[PDB]
């Protein structure tokens, strides 16, 4: 037969791996505490006030 030397062509047609939309990070309490340096063990202790009973 007839033999032809051809290049292999690579294309981008917008077919990508379908991948999730990100919604959770805005819905959660982010950074109410920051000063983790300047606290021992990178821990900030949050105080819950006292309630009593009569």
């Amino acid at each position: 037969a007839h033999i032809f030397v051809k290049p292999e062509l690579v294309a981008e047609i917008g077919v990508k791996q379908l991948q999730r939309e990100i919604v959770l990070p805005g819905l959660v309490w982010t950074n109410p505490l920051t000063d983790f340096g300047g606290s021992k063990n990178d821990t900030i202790t949050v105080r819950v006030p006292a309630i009593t009973t009569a």
């Binding site: 037969a1 033999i3 032809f4 292999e8 690579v10």
Partner: protein, 48 residues
């Protein structure tokens, strides 16, 4: 060969079948529905 000879097998067709990217499909008129062909579920190649 000769011009009058029957058409011989195209090397392009052989390579095309070797690559295995020609779409095979389920027979539309078959009942019950056929199982999916092997090529229809082959994964994308890791490179090229």
């Amino acid at each position: 060969g000769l011009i009058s000879d029957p058409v011989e097998v195209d090397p392009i067709q052989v390579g095309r079948d070797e690559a295995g990217w020609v779409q095979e499909l389920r027979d539309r008129e078959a009942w019950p529905k056929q199982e999916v062909p092997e090529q229809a579920k082959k994964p994308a190649k890791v490179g090229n």
